[PDB]
Amino acid sequence: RRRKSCQ
Amino acid sequence: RRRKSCQ
Amino acid sequence: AMGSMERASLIQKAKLAEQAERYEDMAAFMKGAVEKGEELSNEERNLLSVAYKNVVGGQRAAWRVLSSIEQKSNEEGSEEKGPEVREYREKVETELQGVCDTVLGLLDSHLIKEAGDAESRVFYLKMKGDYYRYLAEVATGDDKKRIIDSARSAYQEAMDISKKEMPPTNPIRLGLALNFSVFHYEIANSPEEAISLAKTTFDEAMADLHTLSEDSYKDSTLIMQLLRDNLTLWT
Amino acid sequence: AMGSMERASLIQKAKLAEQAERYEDMAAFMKGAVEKGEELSNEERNLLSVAYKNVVGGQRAAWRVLSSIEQKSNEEGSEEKGPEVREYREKVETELQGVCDTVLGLLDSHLIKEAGDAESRVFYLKMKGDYYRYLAEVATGDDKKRIIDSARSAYQEAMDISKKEMPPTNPIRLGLALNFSVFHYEIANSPEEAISLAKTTFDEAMADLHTLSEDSYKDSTLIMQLLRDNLTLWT
Numbered sequence A, B: 001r002r003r004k005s006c007q
Numbered sequence C, D: 001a002m003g004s005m006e007r008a009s010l011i012q013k014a015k016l017a018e019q020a021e022r023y024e025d026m027a028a029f030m031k032g033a034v035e036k037g038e039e040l041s042n043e044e045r046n047l048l049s050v051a052y053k054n055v056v057g058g059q060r061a062a063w064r065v066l067s068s069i070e071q072k073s074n075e076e077g078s079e080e081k082g083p084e085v086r087e088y089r090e091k092v093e094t095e096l097q098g099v100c101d102t103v104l105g106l107l108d109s110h111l112i113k114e115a116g117d118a119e120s121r122v123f124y125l126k127m128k129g130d131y132y133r134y135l136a137e138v139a140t141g142d143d144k145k146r147i148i149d150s151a152r153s154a155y156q157e158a159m160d161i162s163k164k165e166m167p168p169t170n171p172i173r174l175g176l177a178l179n180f181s182v183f184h185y186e187i188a189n190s191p192e193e194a195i196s197l198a199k200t201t202f203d204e205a206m207a208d209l210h211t212l213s214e215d216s217y218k219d220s221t222l223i224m225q226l227l228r229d230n231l232t233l234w235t
């Protein structure tokens, strides 16, 4: 579960 | 459904 | 190497490269387009961002794989395997830094200085924060604090503009807040600031959803869910 | 550019590049290793194949996307969009051809001529057939028939050796037959030959499974399933 950044 | 080759 | 190609042809080929998942080509075409010296439209800014995010994303993922192997190689009880893991991690790291420097160079020459509307200026300052953040992820030396501060400063200027000039549901504003929150959590060792920013951003966007069309609602809620995903992971 | 790096270090870095999904790097490291002039072990041959198959596989997928767009662009009722689609398809095609020529050059200088054991010789001749097949996929000119015949000839020599020197369940023999069958179906306009080869290969392997350990059985049946997948698609 990797944190989200703006993709 | 793409035919298989040796991967 | 793109100097002889028409701007419109570069943009067309960037879109073809995207369809073909040829992101290195896409980035080279968009760099060529920026270097024509004209401002970018909204669509063109998005193409630039997609291209370089995909290129640097592959490099970052590879760097993390190699960094983990190197870390395991330097544990007690590990057998000496020579300089190769470090050398190859360094090769990937140098390439990654080169891409970040290229993007930062385009922003500095001269995208940011010509960007006057909030949508373009915030977009570019967010990008500047992002690429300094990627430099910070691999930084170990005398300038690491300065790299982190450069990311912080770009994000902060973007935040200040976005809060004054954009509604709380604007997707650029939301994506900026998402990424600045990640900066706080991962780079600046400020998990409480990261959580506070994500929660305030989410709540202020929620309260403004009532003003939006169906399509804008979809756009905004998608990014709000990313904020929520991080809040769930972090709390 | 790999001339100054130790053979063992190139092999080590190829394995790291594989773990990092950096297949262009992996291929460059393996090219460097081949150019040291020593024969390759079984593991090293597999690394060479994995690296270049992944590189050319990405190029082929991109070429097919671009070729389809170009085809649609040249239908009745399509609006003229200029030379850009053709130009970009040609760029990708030329890169793909360059990779195929590089692999064929390694095989010719001097992997095949030094390969005396069936496992190495069949492997390399299969590879030669494969990279001529990839050239044939994009060929349109005066040499297209000669490219197809070069693929056929390499596959046929590999088949002749494999039938004499390997059991019908050997994974190299099976993968060769799979790929030659695809050649017949897709390149040589010989679907009946493709089907006959796949079925005979499958049936002869089935009859030899009883001789195998559990692990070899797993290896062979995996490739047999690929043969069956094609037979199901084609019949």
Ligand SMILES: CN(CCS)C(=O)c1ccc(F)cc1
Residues within 6 Å of the ligand: A005, A006, A007, C049, C123, C126, C171, C172, C173, C174, C175, C176, C178, C222, C223
């Ligand atoms: C849906 N997404 C990406 C996830 S935040 C956007 O709308 C976006 C927002 C800001 C930006 F700089 C690029 C893209």
Ligand SMILES: CN(CCS)C(=O)c1ccc(F)cc1
Residues within 6 Å of the ligand: B005, B006, B007, D049, D123, D126, D171, D172, D173, D174, D175, D176, D178, D222, D223
């Ligand atoms: C499982 N696979 C790949 C699918 S055929 C093999 O065992 C293999 C066989 C021949 C070759 F040249 C490379 C790989």
Ligand SMILES: [Cl-]
Residues within 6 Å of the ligand: C087, C088, C091, D013
């Ligand atoms: Cl290296």
Ligand SMILES: [Cl-]
Residues within 6 Å of the ligand: C013, D087, D088, D091
């Ligand atoms: Cl082109």
Ligand SMILES: [Mg+2]
Residues within 6 Å of the ligand: C118, C165, C166, C167
């Ligand atoms: Mg406004």
Ligand SMILES: [Mg+2]
Residues within 6 Å of the ligand: D118, D165, D166, D167
């Ligand atoms: Mg034998």
